[PDB]
DNA sequence: TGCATCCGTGAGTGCAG
DNA sequence: TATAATGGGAGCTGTCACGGATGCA
């Protein structure tokens, strides 16, 4: 959903 | 039109000069508190504790009491509103409130009642009515408490007109988007199909047929085009005829006689013109009390004709219209 | 109201066909200097300037009075468009 | 003249200071006058103690201070600055490891100060911070709208200081918990706090219903710190649940009193609600290693016992005024302050853990600007920072007392239902029920009751006298709506002997319901009728004869009353007209006893008994936000011996110290030949003659001279191609001369600007080659006057740079402002109104010879048509005239208190005493009755106004007592066939004058992308022909007229340019091409990868770009 | 509120403008597919013409909102409401708007097909008899 | 010729390129000194 | 933008950027705010004010509104007489208010002869928020509305304002005079009833003069002979209108 | 298969601003 | 251009009603 927690 | 226009400036001119020399005014002394009032006010309290006792003696409930406390006070309001107008027409028939309301120049019985009699039962914020009515008149003057109680109602109507408007407006825009392409594109689509306007409404009171209200029949019939011959009270109304306002009043009379129950009429529910309607299935250009000119954007007219009233529709109210459209 | 409107609506089959005939004729006159008018100098619409009476400039006032005279023909497919737009620039030049 | 008062109510306390909500609140947030030692942790201070100290190296907070302002209020007003104070804050940095101590006092920027009348100057423009109403911090219970017998519980903190949490008990028996819209079983949480299965029944132990249902040991099979990680899973799908980060999350959501603050109010509310004291404004604690709950179990207690039947577990009326509360200005600005401090700390720790951990100071570890911009922001673009309403001194005072339910932290328009807008039973004596706006904002913006005040917790409360036994004390006490509901409170006007309750029935409310009750049962009494209504509403005489819906317009239109040069206070008043001028801080008074030394159009100096020579100077002809001359005039003469508190100068709309929003005029109430139609008003030319309804107005006209890439802009008197006529009123520099007459077209300031890459084209170079004048390189960019404006140059400000004092936005050399005055007589189109909701537009001005007049030759001033009254039901205006008749012949004014004023006998008595003056004067001056007065009386008798068989004087007497008099049409001398109502009425000029509103355009500016004409008078607009108008033209079948509005008149640039050549040339207008705005539509769909194609009938494209986009 | 039935009818008639298929007979249509009642009655002629089976259909009652969004003209429908849903679906089908109704021509800015703009009246000519007779005489002989 | 319909349909990438006059290579607007458009950017006039 | 996930805001505010679909759609979208209706040239606004002297087909247009709204036409006529040498100098006369000479107004009066303007009032609920009028010039700012048309517009004079629109082509002029002129639009298109019709003062004036007194003095006596009835009334015992 | 349940889309006009 | 440094940070709250597409006993 949240494209930063994804990459994190 | 030309003459009615001149006729109209004419009524404009004289009606205006007369209005001023006539001597019409408003002084506090024109709000005639009829004296029948305190009879009815006294007559109420006794019957009020006439019910505060069939409960004081635990004879029946609060849901029972309230139910009947407020039927008392509403038919009381009726009484004094009457005595206001009886007292006017019998004694001071040239009083300015009476004149103004009676002609249709302003005012109506329920406002005028609140100048002269009592204000009445007021609303509580919820939607329930106060069992205490404000008995003060506007001539007499309200108690601060009466003034406050009376405040909820007005605000709850202020909010009403403000939200509601949004819906009337929105509703109108839908109506235009769904009818706009509808124009009067040809003279006759040759359809052999029609609709039968009833002059009778099948009751459940007698659950027999009773005649329908005149204005309602005028609105199903005025300016239509008969799709079949009709012969009533020796008159012959022919296929193709645009029912004039008199053709209408006639058929109501033929129906009061028993010669007719429903009139076959060329409706646009049955026009077969593509993308529009034809002349016959439409009828008059009501704006001109004559058959409609090919080219009239009827669909847009329709929409403006249905939307413009709702502002202005107080509940169901306008909701029910929307739930239907 | 417009002088003699109820009879205008009587000539046409639909009120909007009057409007188009009027507005068309109205402009035949504006470009041509009225010379094609089918009025006589007493029927001429006249306005009143501060100096004195003068021919009405409003080509529509004209067109409508003209229509009442009967001295005009209305209908569809009566001429080639370009045979008119010069036979008239011939009979009454710009 | 003499002033008769009516009314039997002895009002114990006065109206309180009517700006207190604005002044008390701010000063209580600054404390700029409290010795720092003695300050108190609320407001500006409290924010400091919240954000500090900054944590790993540790930076701590000592104290703050405030300096006086760089410039005084007026100075900032003129120079478009802000009236602010410097904010210094003394800080000590200490090193987490060594003992480092540095200590500086670092400048944080300027805080904007509040003037005496309780407003603000922000970029040199007075503004007001409207209090905000919102639900109040606390815990509430409310029935579930789905399942009739189950109830949600809600936990609400101050806005943006915590999350909302709901406790709906699901249809599976065990209780739920919502946070950031995530549901999960409650027990998991109670575990984390250290809870044991038994200490639950040990505390609930009643409701085997669900006390026993809430328990589910799939969860109990864990220690506290176990479920603690159990839950972090439930709110962070993806974050690794390390026990240093899961404690960090919940703590930072439920116990960290640094982003979770229940109100200070919220503590007390849920405190007394749940019957438990509270350590801090915080749900949970972190004490001795783990979590120690404070609120969740108490809340849990209530909810359950409600869902069975328990006593004292009521739902809550969330619209009650014990559960709604007010964010006054001080609070609202501190919130923004707690947000600058918050950002500033994000940036210190950033430079704490990078840059040098030992050679650092408070000075360079703080960048103030994040604070600066948060303040600047709240004051320059908030929805609660409003351009001040200083139309007249009341409009400014009413503003400061306004209440918005809207705004950041409140409701969006769409959020607003009914219940927020309804009048609440508890508004009684707190929020006026009349003064609200008609339209969308109805019931969101409201006004502060006149006697009401907001307490330290932010609740409105209202005073009531205590009645004990049956006798009424003078001890007044202010109650929140909650304690109010405890008592039986009798009405303001219950009749007394001395201080005992005479009546045997008393008219009282319990919990706002109206009850009839004996004086033994009565505990308190209203203070005054004035305590239920707005300030404006309280200015309305005979309010109790006016329907509510037009008392409301009467209230609001006041604030729109234009200050009149001959303004006068109403001949009928309510007894507040004086205070209002007082607190309006616009009139000018005497500080102590003394004597008047000098007096002058410009200043007033007074020698005091204290030997001081105080010199008050006079704000003479100041322009207000709305253009309405704010002018102070002196009301004492040299030597006048003045006690303390007496008047020295009249403000605007003040006449010897009474609020003068309009003028008293002789009013006749009758149709008048059409010019009365549908609320239009007819007036006597005599009103312009004696300069009634005339008002001074000023418009500022600014211009800037700026540095360009093509040259500088010059403010000159040297403007090419312009005739000495066109310059005769300009000084050598290019400024109009103070004291001139400027009208449309006139240059006020010459300005020159350099010509671009259109330096003359061939067509133009050649044309000048003929005229022996070669291309000039500068341009006339002067500032002219716009259409429909003009006046008398009153003043000019010239700010250059290179001069002292001054420095302007980058790239501007000099700016010039020129203020222009206009005297405005009343005129056909201006709008008039009276305090009863009667409003109309002056439709005709007759010469005095046509005005109706009375037999003794006097002509009426105003003719108001009676058709206005009946349907509007605002009878009070009728009384206002009758008693105004009397006062016009006895030379009297009256004070009729609202709801406690002059009744009908009391005024009919006055109306007789006036009759003798009006007529007896006559029968002695050699004139008897008149022949037309008998013809009228003949008629009046048929009507039934007069008693048949009675002397003319007897009968005229009878009509006079009715407010009615004989009236002669001045066009004929013949009487009005009837007797009319003539009297004296207070009637104001409203801000809505035709001069501000007549506008028209042939052609003008256009819009960048759409090429359609701009909007608004100031842009030289065009008129929006919207969807509904298009429909109109559509319904008529006006095809060509519609097409015109859609092409030639808006954005068919070809045929538009093509037409305005055809008109000027006398040729019919060209048939139109495609609107340039449809093209914009095509290209905007292309830019979405959508291929829109115009096609001829044989289906092959049509280039509506005439090849300009083909290749 | 006196208000002539004919107005409501016109609207209602649009509410009933569409129909649902129930057996495609011998056509490319599909059970459940919705379309204008005109367009199925239209080709059910083309099918009684080539003698094949006719489409079984069924009356559909839509409300006003849906009935406008379902109109043929994607320019009317897009400018109404639900612009992207309207616009995507029309682009996919390469919908070509015939410009039959009013909004369609309002956005293009052409003469609307009503009133003075109605094909029934817009083509009318007006000539004075002293120019109609003028031009009919030369054109009698070649 | 005379517009009589309005077609709307999908843009093939080739077609999008069929429209284009320029690939906007740089995210530059206009030169911070010349105030003229930087080339290969959103206002480049060669495109 | 905004459609999926977070919306792209610029730094230092929370304001979604305006995506191409945002441009296209909504009440402020391109369709509803620029295609189905634009702003327009040759149009003005002002306060309305009742003119009872007006004839049904007329209105009161401030001459200053008139000058601008017809500025092209005035410029030409100003030449076709000679109040200026050419059109461009004619325009510079009317640009500063001092330079306007009296025969400009006689020149305008010439201009608007016969042609009508359009009046619009606030909510155009139906076809008759717009009607057409021959304008007669007037000093002063306010527009003059005819009392008969106030109902259709729902106009009173608590401060209402109205919009003015000059048709331009001979076709638009012919449309307004024939189809949209007030006097031709007397019946409602919704009910077919009349819509221009007496209202507040006008009926009050006629009711008064057409009511009849009913007096109570005589109270219905029985007299056999007129001869004596009069006498009784001359006695003062029986009021003139008693039945 | 029938029915919760979520996601997305609407929510009057013009003028002042 | 070179100590060593290795998974973010702020949610936002009091509308509503309908229509369609999806999940679930
Ligand atoms: N949000 C609003 C507010 C007002 N108006 C216009 O202004 C009119 C409101 O005036 P009212 O006084 O409320 O209505 P009247 O019909 O004039 O009342 P009355 O019978 O007492 O004259 C309605 C409407 O034409 C509007 O369209 N939209
Ligand atoms: Mg109005
Ligand atoms: Mg009204
Ligand atoms: Zn048909």
Nearest CA to ligand 1 atom 9: G154
**What does residue G17 show for φ and ψ, rounded to 5 degrees?**
-75, 160
Class of domain B28-162: mainly alpha
- Sign of the Cα torsion C6, C11, C17, C20 reads negative
Nearest CA among D84, E67, D92, E123 for reference residue B181: E67
Return the residue matching tokens 């005297």. D823
**Distance I2 C1' – D353 CA (angstroms):** 21
Residues B96 and D866 sit within 8 Å (Cβ to Cβ) = yes
CA-CA distances (angstroms) from residue D917 to B33, D4, D889, D891?
Answer: 31, 18, 7, 11
Chains A and B contact (Cβ–Cβ under 8 Å for 3 or more pairs): no
What's the CA B309/C1' H12 distance, rounded, in angstroms?
Answer: 13
How far, in Å, CA of D884 to CA of D902, rounded?
Answer: 12
Domain D134-327 has CATH 3.90.1110.10: yes
Annotated binding site of G for Mg(2+): 156, 158, 160
How far, CA to CA in Å, does D678 sit from each of B13, B158, G49, G146?
16, 22, 10, 11
- From residue D650, alpha-carbon distances to B78, D584, D646, D693, D761 in Å are 54, 12, 11, 18, 63
- Nearest C-alpha neighbor of B182 from the set B286, B285, B295: B295
CA of G155 to the centre of ligand 3 (A): 8
Distances (CA, A) of D349 to D249, D286, D345, D346, D995: 20, 24, 6, 6, 59
CA of D965 to C1' of I16 (A): 59
The CATH number given to whatever domain includes residue C55 is 3.90.940.10
Q: Give the closest residue to D366 by CA, choosing from D65, D60, D36.
A: D60
Give whole-number Cα distances, G97 to D698, E124, G91, G102, in Å: 20, 47, 12, 12
The shortest CB-CB distance from C23 to any of G114, G174, G184 is to G174
H strand bases under 7 Å from protein CB = 9-17
Q: Do D974 and B21 touch (CB under 8 A)?
A: yes
Which one-letter DSSP state was computed for residue D414? G
What CA–CA distances, in Å, run from D732 to D79, D749, G227? 25, 11, 99
> H/E/C letters for each residue in C39-94?
CCCCCCCEEECCCCEEECCCHHHHHHHHHHHCCEEEECCCCCHHHHHHHHHHHCCC
With CA atoms as reference, the chain D residue closest to B92 would be: D943
> Torsion over CA of D132, D133, D138 and D140, rounded to 10 degrees?
-150
Q: Which one-letter DSSP state was computed for residue D1088?
A: T
Closest residue (Cα, C1') to I17: B323
Distance D871 CA to ligand 3 centre (A): 9
> How determined?
X-ray
The DSSP H or E segment spanning D47 is helix D44-51
| Side-chain half-sphere CA neighbours of D334 within 13 A | 25
Q: Is A5 on the interface with D (CB under 8 A)?
A: yes
Q: Is D912 helix (H, G, I), strand (E, B) or coil?
A: helix
**Chain G interface includes C59 (CB < 8 A):** yes
Give the position of tokens 């945002």. Answer: G22
Smallest CA–CA separation between A7 and chain G, in Å?
16
| Helix (H) or strand (E) run with residue D749 in it | strand D747-749
The separation between CA B159 and the C-alpha centre of its own chain, rounded to angstroms, equals 23
How many CB atoms within 10 Å of residue B10? 12
Closest CA to D916 of D957, D944, D876: D957
CA distances to B194, B232, B280 from B267, in Å: 6, 22, 8
Q: Which nucleotides of I are covered by protein (CB under 7 A)?
A: 7-16, 18-20
Of D1092, D1100, D1109, the CB nearest to F8: D1092
CA distances from D226 to B75, D189, D813 (A): 71, 11, 70
Tell me the CA–C1' distance in angstroms for D428 and H4.
Answer: 45
User: What DSSP line would sit under D302-329, residue for residue?
Assistant: HHHHHHHT-TT-----TTSTTSEEEE-H
**Class in CATH terms, D694-825:** mainly beta
Return the closest-CA partner of residue G179 out of B223, C9, C45. Answer: C9
Tokens of B302: 């329709």
Residue D926 tokens read as 């050699």
Place of tokens 């043929």: E72
Q: How many beta carbons lie within 10 A of that of residue D512, not counting itself?
A: 17
Whole-Å CA distances, D75 to B217, D72, D79: 76, 5, 6
Scan residues 214-233 of D and list those with Cβ closer than 8 Å to G. Answer: none
Return the residue of G nearest to D671 by Cα: G201
Closest CA to D824 of D696, D699, D700, D991: D696
CB of E118 less than 8 A from some CB of G:
no
Which of these, B182, G156, G153, lies nearest to D840 by C-alpha position? G156
HSE-CB for D214 with a 13 A CA cutoff: 32
Is D972 within 7 A of strand I by CB distance?
no
Say if CB D872 and CB D838 are below 8 A apart.
yes
Q: Do residues D197 and D301 touch, judged by C-beta distance below 8 A?
A: no
D331 Cβ contact partners less than 8 Å away, ≥ 6 residues apart? D25, D29, D43, D458
Q: What is the CA radius of gyration of chain E?
A: 22
**How many Cβ atoms from other residues are within 10 Å of residue D349's Cβ?**
16
Please measure the distance between the N-terminal and C-terminal CA atoms of chain F and give it in whole angstroms. Answer: 29
Which 3 state secondary structure label does DSSP give E57? Answer: strand
Q: Which class for G212: exposed (0-12), middle (13-18), buried (19 or more C-beta within 10 A)?
A: exposed
The Cα D624–Cα D697 span in angstroms is 9
Per-position DSSP letters for D691-730, written without gaps between them: T-S-EEEEEEEEEEEEEETTEE-B--S--TT--GGGGTTB
Which residue's entry shows tokens 């058929």? B251
Closest ligand 1 atom, CA of D678? 22
Indicate yes or no: strand H within 7 A of the C-beta of B125.
no
Nearest residue (Cα to C1') for I5? D354
Residue in chain B closest to C12 (alpha carbons) equals B293
**Coil, strand, or helix at residue G237?**
coil
CA distances from G64 to G55, G61, G89 (A): 22, 8, 19
Distance CA D1042, CA D827 (A): 35
| Nearest of D1042, D21, D953, D112 to residue G180 by alpha carbon | D1042
CB-based contact (8 Å) between D688 and chain F? no
- Which ligand lies nearest to the CA atom of residue B271 in the structure? 4
Residue pair G180/G132 in contact (Cβ under 8 Å)? The answer is yes
For β-strands D633-634 and D603-608, DSSP reports them as unpaired
On whether the CB atoms of residues D265 and D457 are closer than 8 A, the answer is yes
- Residues from chain D contacting residue E117 (CB–CB below 8 Å): 1037, 1039-1040, 1043
Q: Which residues in chain C touch residue B285, judged by CB atoms under 8 angstroms apart?
A: 15
Hunting for tokens 């549908």 — which residue is that?
A: D678
Q: Which of residues 394-433 of D touch B (CB under 8 A)?
A: 418-419, 421-425, 428, 433
Q: Phi/psi at B110 (nearest 5 deg)? A: -75, -40
Two structure tokens written together for D774: 């070669």
Q: After which residues is chain D discontinuous, taking C to N > 2.5 Å? A: 56
Hunting for tokens 């006048």 — which residue is that? D640
- Check: CB of residue F11 under 8 Å from CB of residue D1087: no
H helices of E50-120, in order, are 64-69, 74-80, 83-92, 102-108
Which run of H or E residues covers position D110? Answer: strand D101-112
Strands G43-50 and G143-145, bridge-based pairing:
parallel
CA nearest neighbour of D838 among D666, D987, D677, D663:
D987
CB E103 within 8 A of CB E77: no
Whole-Å CA distances, C29 to C19, C39, C94, G78: 16, 12, 10, 22
Q: How far apart are CA D1001 and CA D1022, in angstroms?
A: 6
Q: C1 in contact with B at a CB cutoff of 8 Å?
A: yes
Which residue intervals of chain G are DSSP H helices? 20-24, 30, 63-69, 71-81, 87-93, 103-111, 150-153, 170-175, 200-210, 226-235
Using CA atoms, how far apart are residues D670 and B20, in angstroms rounded to an integer? Answer: 6
Does residue F4 contact residue D1096 with C-beta atoms inside 8 Å?
yes
DSSP summary character for residue G29: S
Contact in structure between D391 and D626 (CB atoms under 8 Å): yes
| Residues of chain B contacting residue C9, judged by C-beta atoms under 8 Å apart | 288
Residue G224's CB is within 10 A of a number of other CB atoms, namely 7
Closest C-alpha among G124, G147, G146 to residue G135: G146
Alpha-carbon distances, residue D91 vs D104, D663, F17 (angstroms): 6, 60, 63
Could you identify the residue written with the tokens 């809870």? D195
Residue D696 CB contacts under 8 Å (≥ 6 apart), including other chains: D563, D565, D621, D628, D629, D631, D821, D822, D823, D824
D548 contacts D533 by C-beta, under 8 angstroms: no
Largest distance between two CA atoms of chain A: 12
DSSP D55-87: ---EEEEEEEEEPPPSS-HHHHHHTT---EEEE
Question: With contact defined as beta carbons under 8 Å apart, do G131 and G182 qualify?
Answer: yes
Q: Best interface-test mutation with G: which of D1044, D1076, D1085 has the largest number of G CBs within 10 A? A: D1044
Cβ neighbors of B120 (< 8 A, separation 6 or more) are B73, B74, B77, B113, B114, B133, B134
The half-sphere exposure of D978 on its side-chain side, counting CA atoms within 13 A, is 28
Domain interval for residue C9? 1-94
Q: Helices D904-915 and D876-889: crossing angle, nearest 10°? A: 30
Q: Is the distance from CB of D232 to CB of D250 less than 8 angstroms?
A: yes
Q: Which atom of ligand 1 is nearest to the CA of D439?
A: 1
**Torsion (CA) D185, D191, D193, D195 in degrees, nearest 10:** 120
In angstroms, the CA D426 to CA D406 distance is: 20
- Give the whole-angstrom CA distance, residue B295 versus residue E17: 21
**Residues facing residue B235 across a β-bridge:** B232
User: Would you tell me which residues 31-60 of chain E have a C-beta closer than 8 angstroms to some C-beta of chain D?
Assistant: none
CB contact under 8 A, B215 and E113: no
How far apart are alpha carbons B141 and D216 in whole angstroms? 66
Single out the residue of D376, D301, D306, D372 nearest to residue D340, CA to CA: D372
């Amino acid at each position: 959903s949240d494209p930063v927690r994804q990459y994190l | 039109m030309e003459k009615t226009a001149r006729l109209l400036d004419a009524l404009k001119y004289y009606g205006f000069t007369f209005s001023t020399t006539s001597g019409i005014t408003i002084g506090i002394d024109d709000a005639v508190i009829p004296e029948e009032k305190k009879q009815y006010l006294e007559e109420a309290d006794r019957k009020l504790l006439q019910i505060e006792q069939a409960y004081e003696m635990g004879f029946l409930t609060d849901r029972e009491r309230y139910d009947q406390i407020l039927q008392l006070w509403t038919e009381t309001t009726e009484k004094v509103t009457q005595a206001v107008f009886k007292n006017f027409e019998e004694n001071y028939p040239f009083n300015p409130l009476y004149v103004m309301a009676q002609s249709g120049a302003r005012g109506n019985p329920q406002q005028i009642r609140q100048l002269c009699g009592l204000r009445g039962l007021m609303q509580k914020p919820s939607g329930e009515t106060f069992e205490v009515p404000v008995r003060s008149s506007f001539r007499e003057g309200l108690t601060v408490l009466e003034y406050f109680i009376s405040s909820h109602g007005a605000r709850k109507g202020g909010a009403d007109t403000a939200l509601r408007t949004a819906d009337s407006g929105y509703l109108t825009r839908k109506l235009v988007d769904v009818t706009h392409e509808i124009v009067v594109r040809e003279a006759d689509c040759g359809t052999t199909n029609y609709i039968s306007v009833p002059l009778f409404q099948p009751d459940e009171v007698t659950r027999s047929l009773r005649l329908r209200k005149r204005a309602d029949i005028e609105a199903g019939l005025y300016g239509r085009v008969l799709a079949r011959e009709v012969e009533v009270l020796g008159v012959r109304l022919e296929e193709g005829r645009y029912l004039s306002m008199d053709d209408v009043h006639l058929l109501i009379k033929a129906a009061e006689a028993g010669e007719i129950q429903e009139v076959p009429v060329r409706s646009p529910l049955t026009c077969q013109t593509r993308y529009g309607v034809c002349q016959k299935c439409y009828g008059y250009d009501l704006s001109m009390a004559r058959p409609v000119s090919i080219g009239e954007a009827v669909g847009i007219v329709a929409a403006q004709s249905i939307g413009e009233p709702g502002t202005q529709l107080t509940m169901q109210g306008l909701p029910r219209v929307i739930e239907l459209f | 109201a417009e002088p003699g409107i109820d009879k205008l609506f009587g000539m046409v089959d639909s009120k909007y066909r009057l409007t188009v005939v009027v507005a068309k004729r109205a402009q035949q006159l504006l470009r041509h200097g009225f010379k094609n008018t089918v009025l006589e100098p007493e029927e001429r619409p006249k306005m009143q300037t501060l100096e004195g009476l003068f021919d009405d400039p409003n080509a529509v006032t004209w067109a409508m009075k003209e229509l009442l005279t009967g001295r005009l023909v209305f209908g569809e497919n009566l001429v080639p468009e370009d045979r008119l737009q010069k036979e008239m620039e011939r009979l009454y030049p710009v | 003249m003499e002033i008769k008062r009516f009314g039997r109510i002895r009002e114990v306390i006065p109206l309180p200071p009517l700006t207190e909500i604005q002044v008390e609140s701010y000063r209580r947030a600054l404390q700029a006058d409290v010795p720092p030692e003695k300050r108190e942790n609320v407001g500006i201070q409290a924010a400091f103690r919240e954000t500090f100290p900054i944590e790993e190296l540790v930076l701590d907070f000592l104290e703050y201070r405030l300096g006086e302002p760089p410039f005084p209020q007026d100075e900032c007003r003129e120079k478009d600055l802000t009236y602010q104070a410097p904010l210094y804050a003394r800080l000590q940095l200490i090193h987490k490891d060594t003992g480092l101590i540095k200590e500086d006092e670092v400048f944080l920027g300027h805080i904007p100060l509040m003037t005496e009348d309780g407003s603000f100057i922000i970029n040199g423009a007075d503004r007001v911070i409207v209090s905000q109403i919102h639900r109040s911090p606390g815990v509430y219970f409310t029935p579930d709208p789905a399942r009739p017998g189950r109830y949600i519980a809600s936990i609400i903190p101050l806005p943006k200081r915590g999350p909302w949490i709901d406790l709906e008990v699901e249809p599976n028996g065990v209780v739920s918990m919502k946070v950031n819209k995530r549901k999960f079983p409650l027990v998991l949480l109670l575990r984390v706090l250290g809870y044991d299965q038994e200490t639950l029944a040990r505390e609930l132990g009643a409701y085997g219903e669900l006390v026993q249902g809430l328990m589910d040991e799939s969860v109990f099979a864990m220690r506290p710190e176990e479920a603690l990680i159990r839950l972090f899973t439930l709110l962070r799908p993806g974050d690794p649940p390390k026990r240093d980060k899961a404690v960090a999350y919940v703590y930072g959501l439920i116990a960290d009193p640094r982003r979770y603050d229940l109100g200070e109010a919220g503590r007390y509310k849920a405190e007394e609600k749940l019957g438990i004291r509270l350590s801090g404004r915080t749900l949970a604690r972190f004490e001795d290693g783990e979590f120690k709950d404070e609120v969740f179990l108490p809340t849990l207690r209530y909810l359950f016992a409600l869902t069975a039947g328990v006593p004292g577990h009521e739902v809550d009326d969330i619209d009650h005024l014990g559960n709604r509360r007010i964010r006054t200005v001080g609070e609202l600005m501190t919130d923004q302050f707690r947000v600058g401090l918050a950002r500033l700390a994000r940036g210190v720790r950033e430079r704490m853990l990078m840059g040098s951990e030992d050679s650092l100071t408070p000075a360079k570890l703080v960048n103030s600007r994040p604070l600066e911009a948060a303040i600047r922001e709240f004051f320059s673009r908030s929805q609660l920072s409003q351009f001040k309403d200083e139309t007249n001194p009341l409009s400014s005072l009413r503003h400061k007392r306004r209440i918005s339910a809207l705004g950041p932290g409140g409701l969006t328009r769409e959020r607003a239902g009914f219940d927020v807008r309804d009048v609440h039973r508890t508004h009684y004596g707190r929020i006026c029920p009349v003064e609200t706006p008609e339209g969308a904002n109805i019931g969101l913006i409201t006004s502060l009751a006149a006697y009401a005040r907001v307490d330290e917790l932010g609740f409105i409360r209202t005073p009531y006298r205590r009645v004990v036994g049956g006798v009424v004390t003078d001890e007044v006490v202010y109650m929140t709506a909650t304690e109010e509901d405890r008592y039986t409170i009798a009405q303001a006007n219950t009749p007394l002997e001395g201080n005992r309750i005479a009546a045997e029935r008393v008219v009282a409310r319990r919990k706002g319901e109206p009850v009839i009750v004996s004086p033994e049962e009565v505990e308190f009494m209203d203070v005054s009728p004035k305590q239920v209504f707005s300030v404006n509403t309280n200015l309305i005489p005979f309010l109790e004869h006016d329907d509510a819906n037009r008392a409301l317009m009467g209230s609001n239109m006041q604030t729109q009353a234009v200050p009149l040069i001959r303004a006068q206070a109403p001949v009928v008043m309510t007894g507040l007209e004086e205070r209002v001028v007082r607190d309006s801080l616009a009139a000018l008074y005497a500080e102590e006893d003394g004597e008047v030394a000098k007096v002058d159009g410009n200043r007033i100096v007074v020698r005091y008994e204290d030997g001081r020579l105080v010199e008050y100077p006079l704000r003479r002809f100041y322009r207000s936000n709305q253009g309405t001359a704010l002018d102070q005039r002196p009301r004492v003469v040299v030597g006048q011996r003045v006690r303390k508190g007496d008047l020295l100068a009249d403000g605007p709309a003040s006449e010897n110290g009474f609020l003068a929003l309009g003028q008293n005029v002789l009013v006749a109430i009758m149709p008048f030949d059409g010019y009365n139609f549908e609320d239009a008003i007819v007036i006597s030319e005599e009103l312009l003659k004696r300069d009634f309804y005339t008002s001074i107005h000023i418009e500022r006209y600014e211009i800037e001279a700026r540095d360009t890439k093509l040259g500088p802009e010059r403010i000159t008197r040297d403007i090419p191609h312009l005739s000495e006529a066109a310059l005769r009123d300009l000084d050598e520099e290019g400024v109009v001369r103070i004291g001139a007459e400027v009208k449309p077209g006139d240059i006020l300031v010459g300005r020159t600007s350099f010509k671009g890459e259109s330096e003359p084209t061939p067509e133009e170079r050649l044309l000048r080659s003929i005229f022996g004048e070669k291309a000039r390189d500068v341009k006339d960019t002067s500032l002219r006057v716009p259409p429909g404006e003009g006046g008398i140059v009153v003043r000019t400000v010239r700010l250059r740079r290179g001069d002292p004092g001054v420095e302007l936005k980058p790239g501007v050399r000099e700016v010039v402002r020129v203020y222009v005055a206009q005297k405005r007589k009343l005129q056909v189109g201006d709008k008039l109104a009276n305090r009863h909701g009667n409003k109309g537009v002056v439709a005709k001005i007759l010469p005095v010879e046509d005005m109706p007049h009375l037999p003794d030759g006097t002509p009426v001033d105003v003719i108001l048509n009676p058709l206005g009254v009946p349907s509007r039901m605002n009878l009070g205006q009728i009384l206002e005239t009758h008693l105004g008749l009397a006062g016009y012949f006895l030379g009297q004014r009256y004070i009729s208190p609202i709801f406690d004023g002059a009744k009908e006998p009391e005024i009919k008595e006055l109306l007789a005493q006036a009759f003798e003056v009006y007529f007896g004067k006559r029968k002695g001056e050699g004139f008897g009755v008149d022949k037309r007065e008998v013809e009228v009386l003949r008629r009046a008798e048929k009507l039934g106004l007069v008693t048949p068989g009675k002397t003319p004087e007897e009968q005229l007497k009878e009509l006079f007592l009715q407010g009615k008099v004989v009236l002669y049409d001045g066009r004929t001398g013949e009487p009005i066939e009837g007797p009319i109502v003539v009297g004296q009425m207070f009637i104001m000029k409203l801000y809505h004058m035709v001069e501000d509103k007549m506008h028209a355009r042939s052609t003008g500016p256009y819009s960048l992308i759409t090429q359609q004409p701009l909007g608004g008078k100031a842009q030289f607009g065009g008129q929006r022909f919207g969807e509904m108008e298009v429909w109109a033209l559509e319904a008529y079948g006006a095809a060509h007229t519609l097409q015109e509005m859609l092409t030639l008149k808006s954005d068919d640039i070809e045929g538009r340019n093509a037409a305005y050549e055809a008109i000027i040339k006398g040729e019919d207008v060209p048939e139109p091409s495609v609107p340039e705005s449809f093209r914009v539509l095509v290209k905007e769909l292309q830019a979405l990868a959508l291929d829109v194609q115009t096609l001829d009938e044989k289906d092959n494209p049509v280039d509506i770009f005439e090849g300009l986009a083909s290749k | 509120v006196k208000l002539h039935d004919k107005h409501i009818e016109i609207v209602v008639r649009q509410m009933m403008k569409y129909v649902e298929v129930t057996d495609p007979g011998d056509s490319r249509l599909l059970e459940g597919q919705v379309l204008e009642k005109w367009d199925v009655e239209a080709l059910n002629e083309r099918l009684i013409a080539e003698g094949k089976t006719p489409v079984a259909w069924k009356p559909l009652l839509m409300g006003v909102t849906k009935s406008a969004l379902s109109t043929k003209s994607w320019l009317s429908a897009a400018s109404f409401q639900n612009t992207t849903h309207v616009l995507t679906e029309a682009a996919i089908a390469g919908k070509k708007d015939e410009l039959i109704g009013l909004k369609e021509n309002v956005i293009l800015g052409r003469l609307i097909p009503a009133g003075t703009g109605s094909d029934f009246v817009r083509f009318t000519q007006v000539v004075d008899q002293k120019t109609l007779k003028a031009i009919e005489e030369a054109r009698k002989e070649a | 010729k005379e517009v009589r319909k309005v077609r709307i349909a999908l843009a093939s990438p080739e077609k999008i390129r069929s429209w284009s006059y320029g690939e906007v290579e740089k995210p530059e607007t206009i030169n911070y000194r010349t105030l003229k458009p930087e080339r290969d950017g959103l206002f480049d006039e060669r495109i | 933008n905004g459609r999926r996930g977070a919306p792209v805001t610029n730094p230092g505010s929370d304001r979604p950027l305006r995506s191409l679909t945002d441009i296209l759609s909504g009440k402020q979208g391109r369709f509803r705010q620029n295609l189905l209706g634009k702003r327009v040239d040759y149009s003005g606004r002002s306060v309305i004010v009742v003119g009872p002297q007006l004839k049904l087909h007329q209105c009161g247009l401030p001459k200053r509104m008139a000058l601008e709204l017809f500025k092209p036409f005035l410029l030409k006529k100003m030449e076709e007489k000679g109040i200026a040498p050419n059109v461009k100098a004619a325009r510079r006369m009317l640009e500063r208010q001092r330079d306007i000479k009296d025969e400009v107004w006689d020149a305008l009066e010439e201009v608007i002869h016969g042609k009508v303007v359009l009046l619009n009032r606030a909510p155009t609920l139906h076809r008759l928020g717009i009607q057409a009028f021959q304008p007669v010039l007037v000093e002063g700012q306010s527009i003059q509305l005819h009392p008969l048309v106030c109902e259709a517009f729902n106009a009173d004079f608590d401060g209402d304002q109205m919009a003015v629109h000059v048709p331009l082509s001979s076709f638009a002029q012919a449309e307004a005079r024939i189809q949209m002129l007030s006097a031709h639009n007397l019946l409602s298109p919704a009910s077919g009833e009349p819509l221009a019709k007496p209202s507040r003062d006008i009926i009050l004036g006629l009711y008064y003069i057409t009511q009849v007194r009913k007096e109570k003095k005589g109270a219905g006596l029985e007299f056999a002979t007129p001869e004596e009835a009069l006498a009784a009334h001359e006695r003062g015992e029986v009021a003139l209108n008693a039945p």
